[PDB]
């Protein structure tokens, strides 16, 4: 496996960030790749047996470091808005190019000019239509996560206190509440569909949950509104017999 | 050293055959190695298949790719795509003589669309559990060829087509959501900028 | 320097029989002129040759994709490198240069490549095997070779002696006479 | 029929490392660590093939990290020095006022360290000399070729002086006439 950390991070221009990676494959060679906003995938660094062997003309800002064959860390001394990306760590048996690369889940870095643009989501749940119930004997709940920025969210559905995956589909991408501005807050929707008789049991509970990754407890916050920390925002609904 | 592949998203119905085009034009390396990497939704990047000798064919998961020595290409093919093939596919080359250093293509996002055997297209209004207003407009149960257009209005919000599978029932359905804060906004006209089936059900609230 | 020296050596060897039809790959790690671990394409895995290499043999054989990679080395490494240099390695041909002097008469053929050579004497119509001493093959270290054949057989009355040299770079025997 | 050998070594505590390719006993090329350049034994080879030298430097890094591990695995037991056979050779027929090259061949020695000097009439001769890297052997010792061009004469003697830690006193081979 290839483990990297953190999963999400948001920070203001000029701050320092550190990413850490580990591979358990016994491999000799590890990599940092950069996945920019536009689905592109370019190599940054390659380390072999703790020695830097590949540097694809990365700004002096970035300082990879490896005190061990299995560990590769990336540090960005003072970030620019250009640095917003997904950073993928990978490993290969050795530096031969025939070798398969094994990638980690990625670190999602968002660099902002003004941390005052971070907002958590508002979440609302919309109860099934009486027309849908009588027309199809099915019941769709709709969840809206709105007003959030950046787009570091994970949504899930909880039926009777248990996460469910069947009957669920979430938008693959958020949309821009104001597509003009580059710092526009986002919105996201998800559907959960159950049978009409399941929705019409008043003992059944349905919760939409949105995990938001925002500022840390460390970050300084001067504005009056609540510090937009990493948090969970939910909306719920109980079934209606009639 | 460059890789070019199918740009953007390709939508294919299940059981149809697929071609993902990939050509490489690397002026300065002899004998490259060719790769296809794949990223399934919510997953990480992983190898689909690779070919490391000039004339051979690599195969995996029903996909096939031939390293061509005359057309300088590595096209990905599948005779019958399944719905679980929806992913992003990346074509990549490396120099076999130097350090491993993948040049990636731009990536092709594949969306394999299932067939809806019994469409029942309708638009429903759903109200908030904690508030009377607003509501959301739910377009659901339409056939797989219906295309949902985005809003063209900054104050109306329309999501893309989304497919859910109710596994207990072995049932699939497509759905899009529309909402707005406009007073004028109504579910009867939310999807007017889309071409939806004539028999779409518009219940009277 | 009183200091003791410590030497690590590693050799990746590619053995070719009938060109690239039969290839054998050897990955060999040495410590103080004493191999300790080795991969052999005929065996298919890393094996310790001394106890000193057993931690490597078990560690490497367990790595993700190691075996696959090393099993493919006869194609991606040996056959690859063989074809890259074939023009000036397997197909290099430099013809010899012969001269015959006495000191006992000596025939010396220099600047030839590859090494396989056959040189013979004729005293005169028939080759005389007696009284011949061969220097063996000498490697000049610059992609050429030497050899002298010293001959103790005193010629007498207009005896025509011919050193015949046969090299793979010529189609017919090279003959010179004394 | 043919054997290609990629041979690398690293020596402590001199921080000396070397990377070369051997073909049937003859070197195709070596990598100069200091200049980070690939060095073909024949200049002709470089126009028909290539090699990224930095991959050789990556190997030397690994071998050295391994060496420290291997000496620790071995309780820091040193190498036993082995003295070299040396041999002075001529290249073609020797003829008065006809230019040839003297060859000094150093064989079966380890570690791969050597001080070799060309002596003309007891004086050191330094210009025109050429030299090869150490070349691998099947017994895993080393070979070395040193070349000295000259015009033969009668009032000129030549020696190849070899210094090796395996030898108690410097070894010297003579060539006259």
């Amino acid at each position: 496996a290839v483990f990297q950390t953190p999963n999400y991070h948001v920070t203001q221009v000029g701050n320092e960030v550190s990413f850490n990676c580990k591979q358990t494959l016994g491999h000799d060679t590890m990599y940092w790749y950069k996945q920019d906003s536009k689905k592109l995938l370019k190599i940054m660094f390659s380390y072999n047996n703790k020695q830097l062997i590949v540097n694809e003309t990365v700004p002096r800002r970035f300082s990879p470091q490896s005190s061990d064959k299995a560990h590769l860390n990336l540090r960005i001394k003072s970030v620019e808005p250009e640095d917003s990306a997904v950073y993928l760590c990978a490993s290969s048996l050795d530096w031969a190019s025939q070798n398969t690369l094994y990638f980690g889940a990625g670190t999602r870095l968002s660099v902002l000019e003004d941390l005052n643009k971070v907002f958590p989501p508002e979440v609302a749940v919309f109860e099934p239509s009486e027309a849908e119930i009588s027309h199809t004997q099915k019941a769709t709940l709709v969840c809206l996560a709105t007003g959030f920025f950046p787009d570091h969210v994970e949504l899930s559905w909880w039926v009777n206190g248990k996460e469910v995956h069947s009957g669920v589909c979430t938008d693959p991408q958020p949309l821009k509440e104001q597509p003009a501005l580059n710092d526009s807050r986002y919105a996201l929707s998800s559907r959960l569909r159950v049978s009409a008789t399941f929705w019409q049991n008043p003992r059944n509970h349905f919760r939409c949950q949105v995990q938001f990754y925002g500022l840390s407890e460390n970050d300084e916050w001067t504005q009056d509104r609540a510090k937009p920390v990493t948090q969970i925002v939910s909306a719920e609904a109980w079934g209606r017999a009639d | 050293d460059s890789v070019t592949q199918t740009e953007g998203q390709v939508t294919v119905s299940e059981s149809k055959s697929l071609i993902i085009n990939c050509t490489y034009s690397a002026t300065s390396i002899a004998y490259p190695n060719l790769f296809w990497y794949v990223r399934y939704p919510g997953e990480g990047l992983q190898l689909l298949l690779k070919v490391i000798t000039a004339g051979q064919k690599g195969s995996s998961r029903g996909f096939e790719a031939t390293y061509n020595k005359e057309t300088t290409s590595f096209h990905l093919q599948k005779a019958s795509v399944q719905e679980s093939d929806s992913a992003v596919y990346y074509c990549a080359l490396s120099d076999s003589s130097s350090f491993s250093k993948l040049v990636f293509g731009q990536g092709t996002s594949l969306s394999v669309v299932p067939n809806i055997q019994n469409p029942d297209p309708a638009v429903y209004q759903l109200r908030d559990s904690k508030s009377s207003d607003k509501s959301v407009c739910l377009f659901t149960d339409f056939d797989s060829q219906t295309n949902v257009s985005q809003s063209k209005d900054s104050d109306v919000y329309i999501t893309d087509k989304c497919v859910l599978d109710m596994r207990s029932m072995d049932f699939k359905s497509n759905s899009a959501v529309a909402w707005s804060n406009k007073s004028d906004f109504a579910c009867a006209n939310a999807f007017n900028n889309s071409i939806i089936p004539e028999d779409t059900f518009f219940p009277s609230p | 320097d009183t200091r003791p020296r410590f030497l690590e050596q590693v050799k990746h060897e590619c053995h070719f029989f009938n060109g690239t039809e039969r290839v054998r790959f050897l990955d060999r790690y040495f410590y103080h002129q004493e191999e300790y671990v080795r991969f052999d394409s005929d065996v298919g895995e890393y094996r310790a040759v001394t106890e000193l290499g057993r931690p490597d043999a078990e560690y490497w054989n367990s790595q993700k994709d190691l075996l696959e990679q090393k099993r493919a080395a006869v194609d991606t490494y040996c056959r690859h490198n063989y074809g890259v240099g074939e023009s000036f390695t397997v197909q290099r041909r430099v013809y010899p240069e012969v001269t015959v002097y006495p000191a006992l008469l000596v025939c010396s053929v220099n600047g030839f490549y590859p090494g396989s050579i056959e040189v013979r004497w004729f005293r005169n119509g028939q080759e005389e095997k007696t009284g011949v001493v061969s220097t063996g093959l000498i490697q000049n270290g610059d992609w050429t070779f030497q050899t002298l054949v010293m001959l103790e057989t005193v010629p007498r009355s207009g005896e025509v002696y011919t050193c015949q040299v046969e090299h793979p770079s010529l189609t017919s025997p090279l003959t010179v006479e004394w | 029929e043919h054997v290609i050998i990629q041979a690398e070594f690293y020596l402590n505590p001199d921080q000396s490392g070397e990377f070369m390719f051997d073909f049937d006993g003859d070197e195709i090329f070596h990598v100069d660590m200091a200049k980070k350049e690939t060095v073909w034994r024949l200049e002709e080879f470089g126009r028909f093939a290539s090699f990224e030298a930095q991959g050789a430097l990556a190997n030397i890094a690994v071998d050295k990290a391994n060496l420290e591990i291997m000496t620790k695995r071995s309780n820091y037991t040193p190498i036993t020095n082995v003295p070299p056979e040396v041999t002075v050779l001529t290249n073609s027929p020797v003829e008065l006022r006809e230019p040839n090259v003297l060859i000094c061949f150093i064989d079966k020695f380890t570690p791969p360290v050597v001080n070799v000097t060309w002596l003309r009439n007891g004086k050191p001769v330094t210009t025109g000399v050429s030299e090869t890297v150490f070349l691998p052997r099947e017994d895993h010792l080393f070979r070395k070729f040193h070349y000295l061009p000259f015009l033969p004469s009668t009032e000129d003697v030549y020696d190849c002086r070899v210094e090796h830690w395996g030898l108690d006193e410097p070894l010297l081979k003579h060539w006259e006439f």
Partner: peptide, 13 residues
């Protein structure tokens, strides 16, 4: 034609 170095493997510690 470019030559390929077989990479050296890191020892077990």
């Amino acid at each position: 034609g470019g030559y390929r170095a077989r990479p050296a493997k890191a020892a077990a510690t």
